[PDB]
Amino acid sequence: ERRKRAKVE
Amino acid sequence: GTVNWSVEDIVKGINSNNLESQLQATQAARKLLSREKQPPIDNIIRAGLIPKFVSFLGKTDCSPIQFESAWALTNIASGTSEQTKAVVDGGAIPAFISLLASPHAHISEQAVWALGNIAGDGSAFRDLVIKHGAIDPLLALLAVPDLSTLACGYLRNLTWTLSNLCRNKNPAPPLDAVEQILPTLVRLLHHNDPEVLADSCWAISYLTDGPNERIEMVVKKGVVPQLVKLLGATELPIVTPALRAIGNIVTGTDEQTQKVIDAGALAVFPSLLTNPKTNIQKEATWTMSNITAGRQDQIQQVVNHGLVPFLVGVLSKADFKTQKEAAWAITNYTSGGTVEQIVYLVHCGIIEPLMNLLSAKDTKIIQVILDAISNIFQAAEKLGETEKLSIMIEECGGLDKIEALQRHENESVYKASLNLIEKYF
Numbered sequence: 001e002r003r004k005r006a007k008v009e
Numbered sequence: 010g011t012v013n014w015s016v017e018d019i020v021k022g023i024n025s026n027n028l029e030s031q032l033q034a035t036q037a038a039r040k041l042l043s044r045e046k047q048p049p050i051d052n053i054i055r056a057g058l059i060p061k062f063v064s065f066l067g068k069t070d071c072s073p074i075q076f077e078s079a080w081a082l083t084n085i086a087s088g089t090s091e092q093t094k095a096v097v098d099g100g101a102i103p104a105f106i107s108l109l110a111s112p113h114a115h116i117s118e119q120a121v122w123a124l125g126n127i128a129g130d131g132s133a134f135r136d137l138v139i140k141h142g143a144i145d146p147l148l149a150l151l152a153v154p155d156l157s158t159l160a161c162g163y164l165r166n167l168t169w170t171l172s173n174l175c176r177n178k179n180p181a182p183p184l185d186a187v188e189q190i191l192p193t194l195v196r197l198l199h200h201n202d203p204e205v206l207a208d209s210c211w212a213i214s215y216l217t218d219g220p221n222e223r224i225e226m227v228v229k230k231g232v233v234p235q236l237v238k239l240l241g242a243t244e245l246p247i248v249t250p251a252l253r254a255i256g257n258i259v260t261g262t263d264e265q266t267q268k269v270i271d272a273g274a275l276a277v278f279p280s281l282l283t284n285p286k287t288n289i290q291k292e293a294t295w296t297m298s299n300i301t302a303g304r305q306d307q308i309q310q311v312v313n314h315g316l317v318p319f320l321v322g323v324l325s326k327a328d329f330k331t332q333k334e335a336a337w338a339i340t341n342y343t344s345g346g347t348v349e350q351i352v353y354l355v356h357c358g359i360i361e362p363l364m365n366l367l368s369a370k371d372t373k374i375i376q377v378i379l380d381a382i383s384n385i386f387q388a389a390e391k392l393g394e395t396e397k398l399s400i401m402i403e404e405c406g407g408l409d410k411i412e413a414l415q416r417h418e419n420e421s422v423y424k425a426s427l428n429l430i431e432k433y434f
Binding site: 004006008009 | 040042044048088126129130169173207208211250
């Protein structure tokens with residue numbers, strides 16, 4: 001699982 | 010438009026004394042941070058914008074600037090530890106926790122997401138999020154009769170953030186925080202969305218990655234049957250964490266291991282030990298190695314489920330890391346098994362694949378293998394068959410490999426090598 005996630009477009 | 014602003018222009022708008030100018034500039038910053046590869050996170054930080062964004066989180070009368078600032082800060086917090094630290098240092102944790110109660114679901118969701126990135130940095134920020142009181146309002150968002158009434162993306166972000174509050178060690182999360190979260194985790198673990206199930210399994214895998222008291226609080230909640238079902242899933246993203254969790258659990262006590270067996274886990278291992286994904290094979294064999302280290306009745310259940318031929322198979326052909334776990338599974342089996350269980354091992358064909366692995370340039374597998382051969386000879390002695398076994402080993406090129414190891418740069422290798430060659434050959 002990802003430790004951090006950007007909200008991208 | 011709000012597309013392709015310079016940082017200088019964003020600064021000019023955010024420093025205006027005009028909330029609507031500030032909103033447009035915050036949106037332009039959000040779009041830099043979300044629509045570019047190589048987003049200019051450090052430039053935004055160096056401009057001093059984080060404290061402004063954090064204060065916008067509090068603008069209850071302008072929900073759009075709350076949302077845009079929350080998204081900009083989410084993506085800053087998604088970067089390096091230094092970038093996440095700048096968000097924390099601006100006061101963002103309590104401001105986001107206050108936004109969990111927003112009547113606008115998209116704003117509450119963005120706050121959930123941002124707190125997940127902060128907690129995901131590591132144990133210190135995780136525990137700091139917990140100390141600011143994040144768990145109660147997070148769990149309150151999932152306190153509905155049926156999870157299916159929540160938006161799917163919303164539930165996925167909530168599950169993911171909760172999994173980061175279960176994640177990391179040195180130290181592990183506070184015991185009281187785990188007990189508070191577990192009932193909700195068990196509920197998410199029965200939900201019919203594959204991404205929620207995957208992140209729920211990851212969280213359980215983190216919580217069982219520790220000493221036996223940690224494993225016990227998870228097992229006591231009755232999740233092992235559901236983990237075993239998810240072990241059977243077709244989705245690799247679900248099987249991988251379910252298997253990690255089961256593997257952790259069987260590092261506990263023999264009674265904790267027995268719960269995995271009673272739930273039916275061993276019936277899934279023919280497929281796991283032949284799985285086309287190398288990492289599944291490796292973690293399944295690691296799991297087997299901690300089951301054959303148990304009691305003789307637990308070894309017997311490995312035998313009854315037909316798994317010894319599957320261990321022979323992976324010892325014969327697999328990725329080397331998997332073959333090493335299989336060697337460990339065999340040494341544990343031979344150290345704890347009855348004579349009849351050890352005889353059965355040899356009748357299944359263990360000797361030849363074991364001997365061929367003494368050609369490995371890896372010192373540790375050599376010792377493990379030599380220790381298993383020793384244990385197998387000790388079983389033959391009790392039967393007076395050390396001779397038939399010596400022949401088997403010589404007949405497949407084993408003696409030659411054992412001989413070569415008498416000249417080995419390692420201490421315990423050539424000592425154990427020599428002892429076998431003399432006492433039996």
